[PDB]
Amino acid sequence: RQFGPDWIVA
Amino acid sequence: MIQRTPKIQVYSRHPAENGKSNFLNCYVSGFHPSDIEVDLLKNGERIEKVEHSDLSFSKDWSFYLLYYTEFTPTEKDEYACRVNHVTLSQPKIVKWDRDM
Amino acid sequence: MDAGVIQSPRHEVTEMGQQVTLRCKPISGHDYLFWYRQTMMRGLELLIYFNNNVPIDDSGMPEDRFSAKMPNASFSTLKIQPSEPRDSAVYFCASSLWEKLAKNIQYFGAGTRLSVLEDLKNVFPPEVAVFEPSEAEISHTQKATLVCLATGFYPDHVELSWWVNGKEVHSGVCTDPQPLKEQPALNDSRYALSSRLRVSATFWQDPRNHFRCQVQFYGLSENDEWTQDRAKPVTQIVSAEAWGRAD
Amino acid sequence: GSHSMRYFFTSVSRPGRGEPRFIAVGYVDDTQFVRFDSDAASQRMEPRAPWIEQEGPEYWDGETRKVKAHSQTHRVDLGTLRGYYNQSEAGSHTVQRMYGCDVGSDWRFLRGYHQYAYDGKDYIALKEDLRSWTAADMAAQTTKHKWEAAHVAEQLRAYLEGTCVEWLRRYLENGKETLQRTDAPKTHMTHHAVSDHEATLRCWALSFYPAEITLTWQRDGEDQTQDTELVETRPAGDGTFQKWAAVVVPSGQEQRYTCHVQHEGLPKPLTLRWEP
Amino acid sequence: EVEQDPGPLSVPEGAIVSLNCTYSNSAFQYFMWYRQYSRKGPELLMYTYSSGNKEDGRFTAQVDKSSKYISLFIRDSQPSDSATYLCAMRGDSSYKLIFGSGTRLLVRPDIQNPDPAVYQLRDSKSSDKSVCLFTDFDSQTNVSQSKDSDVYITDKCVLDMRSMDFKSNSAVAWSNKSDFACANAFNNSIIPEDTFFPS
């Protein structure tokens, strides 16, 4: 199971 | 930009026995960037329905892929893997040796 | 300061069978956009959200007649076609950023209040009347309460305000939080609303002072057809008024 | 022993096409279990091991939503880093993210990690304390400031210490048959004359799992590195691995040499000898 | 899915108020509360990640993930807290929130010098109504509908004459008919015995 909901942009 | 050429091993899934069904593998690894062309050859000719694994990568970020197809080794058929990649001035061909 | 989320239209009153378009401009720089609706029956619910203009979760979208797009980072649309009375709701747009969402913050627009009606002949603007202070109240309290009554309107898209000497006032004002129904029995009952404005007796008794109860009503627009007898019940202002007087 | 769950996310810029190519894969230990490819038709996360197939639709909808959202942030990051490095819009570039968690043989949390690379070189990483970042250069410093201000490490540390390690344990159990197996290496030796004065002995390990293995040559009970070579461990394609180690010896002395094999699937290290 | 009692809750100014929601899905991990004023959008108050307790001024939000029960406490309740309170929650696979249906809270103002009166207002020459205003009654009083068709009564509303710290309650009644008198107007209501009728 993935980290989420999602990622901050770089 | 850092480019790394691929390492290549060509080998069978099971110990090869003439006339007996098996899988031919070409494992490419250690390369960057990820775009790469890999064909398996039978007596010099591309084999048509080759599959490959999903792109992944190692601790150093370099990529790796396994290309493979079912085949039946014989005494006289020659198999090889041919790889092209930006690092290569010409496609590299590696012959299958049933003891490596 | 900078704009917050801007939605349009603020109000829409329309006949079923037509296409409705709700629009949203998110705060510039925000890369998430949410559409919600809120109804008496089903409460507050997410329809869809977008990240970088792409729909991420549309599990709350109705399965037919609703479509949401984000053609660029500054603009989103939600369309309903053909519209039906059950689509009536307040629709809210919000925008946010990852670092705000990680603290559960999002920024809401003001809403679009949508009424989709079976039949436009049920639409009526308000009649408006003002009632002047009781002589007794003045004498007992030294204060003076005006009452404004907005009656007979449908649907209930009204905004009532008090104006004294042609400037809008807030102090001393109390307006019902909800309209009431003239025939509670009846579906599609018209509505009524009251407000009060209270001032010092002395201020009411000055004949130089002018009061006005104002009601903005949202109704039919130019595109809607109207053939009835009576005047087309368009979006409009209706007001009533009174002058101060010493005795 | 230890176990790990790791996710890998690669995006490659393609100027002149509509969008980058984005490929994600998940692994438990050496076993792949999911994939996503932005260019494929399904537009879903897909199973790649039998034991995740039992996960229900809520699992699959969520995993697919997360991986698709991750493809969009990779796409933005390619544009951002291009700008940071003032690079042409004409070139193809790569972003890579990996993260995961390990448990010990007791199955408790051992560590978590998260690393990000641009064009195949370290860009920014989470330190082992899971609270702080290391940045490779000034561009990455701009990112790091952004991630500190947003409290990214706190989110990530909560996942790595909780959810990541919980679902890893869930998978180890549901896939116990294949994931908690050990396949001992099948082992043989080969001999070829190379030079009139010399020959190669090649010690083979086949069909083993997990991939970790050590092969060493000794001469008279004494470790050898000279005129030895070890191939990189390689997948057989059926869930198992292969490796060999060779030594060239003066011919006539084959019996001085011995090949030693250690693998978790062996109660005791094996010794092999050439038997003509 | 989240259960929330609709209320309405009516409390006197100064009271502690307790709001709660219950949920079923153990995947929820983020729990929030909002206030919404009538005809406006929702405003975030408090947010909690772990099963646990957070204070901010007069507000305390709590979550118990074992009982699947979340609550919000408001200390020293004020008239301006009068609003609908909604809880919302999500997991970590999506930013989609699931909201409870809301609880309406009315915080009744404390009126320091009640002077309950019922007045007749100079009804309009444009308006077939009589208007009766029941005003200056304390917040212990509640108001009720007419017993019939023809007579309309608005619930109590509170005005703030900002500038002289002064508040008053009012409710309004009207009807076209001949029967209608201010003495008769508010008959369905428990009103103060000392309410002032005038001539």
Numbering used by the authors:
A (entry chain C): 1 to 10
B (entry chain B): 0 to 99
C (entry chain J): 0 to 246
D (entry chain A): 1 to 276
E (entry chain I): 3 to 201
Sentences reproduced from the published study:
Concomitant with our global analysis of 1E6 TCR binding to the APLs, we observed a common interaction element, consistent with our previous findings, that utilized TCR residues Tyr97α and Trp97β, forming an aromatic cap over a central GPD motif that was present in all of the APLs.
The low number of contacts between the 2 molecules most likely contributed to the weak binding affinity of the interaction. In order to examine the mechanism by which the 1E6 TCR engaged a wide range of peptides with divergent binding affinities, we solved the structure of the 1E6 TCR in complex with all 7 APLs used in Figure 2. The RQFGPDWIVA sequence (present in C. asparagiforme) activated the 1E6 T cell with around 1 log–greater potency compared with ALWGPDPAAA. The binding affinity of the 1E6 TCR interaction with A2-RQFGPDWIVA is considerably higher than with the disease-implicated A2-ALWGPDPAAA sequence (KD = 44.4 μM and KD > 200 μM, respectively), highlighting how a pathogen-derived sequence might be capable of priming a 1E6-like T cell. Additional small movements in the Cα backbone of the peptide around peptide residue Asp6 were apparent in the A2-YLGGPDFPTI (KD = ~400 μM), A2-ALWGPDPAAA (KD = ~208 μM), and A2-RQFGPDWIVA (KD = 44.4 μM) structures.
